[PDB]
Amino acid sequence: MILVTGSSGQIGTELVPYLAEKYGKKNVIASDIVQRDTGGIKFITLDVSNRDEIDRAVEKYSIDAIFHLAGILSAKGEKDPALAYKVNMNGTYNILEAAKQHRVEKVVIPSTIGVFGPETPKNKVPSITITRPRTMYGVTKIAAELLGQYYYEKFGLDVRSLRYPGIISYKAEPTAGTTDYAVEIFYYAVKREKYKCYLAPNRALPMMYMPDALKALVDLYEADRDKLVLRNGYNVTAYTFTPSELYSKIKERIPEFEIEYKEDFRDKIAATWPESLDSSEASNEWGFSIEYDLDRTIDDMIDHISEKL
Amino acid sequence: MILVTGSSGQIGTELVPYLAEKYGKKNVIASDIVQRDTGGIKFITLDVSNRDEIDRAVEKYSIDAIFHLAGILSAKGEKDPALAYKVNMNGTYNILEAAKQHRVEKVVIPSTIGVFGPETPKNKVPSITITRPRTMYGVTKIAAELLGQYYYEKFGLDVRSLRYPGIISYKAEPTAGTTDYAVEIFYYAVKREKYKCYLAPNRALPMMYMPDALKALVDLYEADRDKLVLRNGYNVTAYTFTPSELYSKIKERIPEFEIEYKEDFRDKIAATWPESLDSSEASNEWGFSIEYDLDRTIDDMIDHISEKLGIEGKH
Ligand SMILES: NC(=O)c1ccc[n+]([C@@H]2O[C@H](COP(=O)([O-])OP(=O)(O)OC[C@H]3O[C@@H](n4cnc5c(N)ncnc54)[C@H](O)[C@@H]3O)[C@@H](O)[C@H]2O)c1
Numbered sequence A: 001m002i003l004v005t006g007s008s009g010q011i012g013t014e015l016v017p018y019l020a021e022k023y024g025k026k027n028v029i030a031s032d033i034v035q036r037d038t039g040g041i042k043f044i045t046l047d048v049s050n051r052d053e054i055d056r057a058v059e060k061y062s063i064d065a066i067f068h069l070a071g072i073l074s075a076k077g078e079k080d081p082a083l084a085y086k087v088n089m090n091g092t093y094n095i096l097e098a099a100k101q102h103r104v105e106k107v108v109i110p111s112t113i114g115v116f117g118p119e120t121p122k123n124k125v126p127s128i129t130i131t132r133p134r135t136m137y138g139v140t141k142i143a144a145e146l147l148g149q150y151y152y153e154k155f156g157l158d159v160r161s162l163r164y165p166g167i168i169s170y171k172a173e174p175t176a177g178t179t180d181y182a183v184e185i186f187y188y189a190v191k192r193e194k195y196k197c198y199l200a201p202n203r204a205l206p207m208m209y210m211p212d213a214l215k216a217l218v219d220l221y222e223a224d225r226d227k228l229v230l231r232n233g234y235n236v237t238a239y240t241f242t243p244s245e246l247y248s249k250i251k252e253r254i255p256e257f258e259i260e261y262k263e264d265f266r267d268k269i270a271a272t273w274p275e276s277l278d279s280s281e282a283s284n285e286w287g288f289s290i291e292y293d294l295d296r297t298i299d300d301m302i303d304h305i306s307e308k309l
Numbered sequence B: 001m002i003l004v005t006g007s008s009g010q011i012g013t014e015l016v017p018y019l020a021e022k023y024g025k026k027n028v029i030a031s032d033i034v035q036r037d038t039g040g041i042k043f044i045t046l047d048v049s050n051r052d053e054i055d056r057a058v059e060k061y062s063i064d065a066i067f068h069l070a071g072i073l074s075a076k077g078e079k080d081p082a083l084a085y086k087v088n089m090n091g092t093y094n095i096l097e098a099a100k101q102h103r104v105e106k107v108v109i110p111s112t113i114g115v116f117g118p119e120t121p122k123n124k125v126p127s128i129t130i131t132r133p134r135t136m137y138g139v140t141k142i143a144a145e146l147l148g149q150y151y152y153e154k155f156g157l158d159v160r161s162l163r164y165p166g167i168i169s170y171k172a173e174p175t176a177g178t179t180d181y182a183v184e185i186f187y188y189a190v191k192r193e194k195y196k197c198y199l200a201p202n203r204a205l206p207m208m209y210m211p212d213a214l215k216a217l218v219d220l221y222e223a224d225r226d227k228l229v230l231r232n233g234y235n236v237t238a239y240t241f242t243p244s245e246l247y248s249k250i251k252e253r254i255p256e257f258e259i260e261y262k263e264d265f266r267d268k269i270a271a272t273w274p275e276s277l278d279s280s281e282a283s284n285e286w287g288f289s290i291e292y293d294l295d296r297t298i299d300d301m302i303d304h305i306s307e308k309l310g311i312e313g314k315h
């Protein structure tokens, strides 16, 4: 059975039914400290910073695999680093130990471009590169990638991870995250309202659409245990763009749309990250691939965001 | 007022007296969960995994600086990673938060070449490079560097760190660690006994002599803030050699001594580390320098170890 922690997040919201559709409705169990509609799929409240709660859940549902999504993101982490550290650091440690302790075949941890810092090359950055994160979030994530690879090499625990860039999606509502401007913008656009962007006009960052984000995670998860070499830290991306670019492209569809720039601390966060990633390793080892280019995600988002507003 | 954490270790047993001679026994507080003779300097029992204990020591002694040495090393860390994670990771976070919450001006953390991994270049590795450690010890240490750099950037807490290579010394004795063979070999050499080395004969590693290791840590502590651009993660070294090489050089002084190689898990650890480091950033940003080259250290070690084992009466 599959346990998904932090199932109520941007990813978890869609990953759950995605998994249910592919593996069976009662072979998946959603969990978080905040509950949301799981379309019938079994849900349980689980605090990842409490080792006891994790063990008991693994016990009762005979957990076979774990998609560990619980954690605090970059923006919220800078507003409350003590919290980011507690849930991210203590949290992923607890799950690793709980997984190693019991009979857990696999554990997938989504990593982030946040593991990068200002010394990291800005373009075509490969998976093996400099990793000196400047945010509490990025520190806890690089720690996660290393802890996972260590548990694998040391105890054989099959933990894998890929680094997601900014993710565009419509099912889950934005949460003021560093890269969330790429989602908030569509909401203002469909309402033909002026949007106040918090990242610089030319703040280039790698991004991808949720559909490809989901497939990438499951493909990583379905990869043969003995065919993965990098295993942890796979750079994954679909395209790179600036807020200014996304704006103009959306304007081509909704010309009335207006935008203004009022950057804050989140732009300082984004400035420490690379603009584009090289994902050859993910494609070479487990065939990672994108089927939604920018044009396709823009139209798709407008379509979905308008229909639900 | 300086508080040294993990004072009973290789670095600690010699750093305390060093610090005391530089700033006065009265301005130095040694601490550890294991007490050892400190020679006059005040010693207190302090478990860094207990945030409360740290706050109390900092409060009572009005601590202005912390040399945070407490931790579980590479070898011991692999036999008990859970213990390593708890002491090194949460112990370092505890120190940083406690330093920040209180009024500690500086915190100095000794890191290690252990932060590097297979993907790290093997020769003349610069400070900013690939860091994919393959030991629990190394992961907790790179995390410490990052947490330390974060505490500065986020809260303005003045935290600095350098990465030590293998440290050779005659006062503190090896503790079945990874680079301890470089000290152990001298005890066997002086006694004209066959030394069983646990690292492969061609296992090249960066090393340095204790006196230079101590001076480097204190030089970083006193460094001008204006020049500290890297701040955390300064590579530091003196020389690089393989066990067979150190053996031969020692043999030049004591020919009636030999060695055999029976590698264990520690050689597997060493194999994921680089052979030599580039310590330019440290020299440029805060003046790091070496006083003991390989020959001077071999000869000084033979000297001290010989009298330590009573081969040549203390006079
Ligand atoms: N947001 C991104 O752009 C991004 C990109 C790459 C990787 N990631 C990683 O993916 C994971 C989640 O991503 P997301 O986009 O769904 O973020 P999200 O903010 O949408 O969801 C995170 C979830 O963590 C939950 N959570 C917080 N504390 C918890 C606890 N103690 N126990 C259980 N759940 C807890 C939250 O309630 C939330 O549902 C994180 O671990 C993050 O590091 C995020």
Ligand SMILES: NC(=O)c1ccc[n+]([C@@H]2O[C@H](COP(=O)([O-])OP(=O)(O)OC[C@H]3O[C@@H](n4cnc5c(N)ncnc54)[C@H](O)[C@@H]3O)[C@@H](O)[C@H]2O)c1
Residues within 6 Å of the ligand: B005, B006, B007, B008, B009, B010, B011, B012, B013, B031, B032, B033, B034, B046, B047, B048, B049, B068, B069, B070, B071, B072, B073, B087, B091, B110, B111, B112, B113, B141, B163, B164, B165, B166, B167, B175, B177, B179
């Ligand atoms: N030994 C080396 O060659 C070397 C090289 C580079 C960096 N370092 C770093 O220097 C520090 C100490 O080095 P060392 O050579 O003196 O190692 P050591 O093994 O000689 O000493 C480590 C000390 O940590 C203490 N300790 C363990 N848990 C503790 C706790 N919970 N609270 C307080 N103390 C605790 C031990 O009792 C011991 O005295 C470590 O942080 C290590 O990562 C060591």
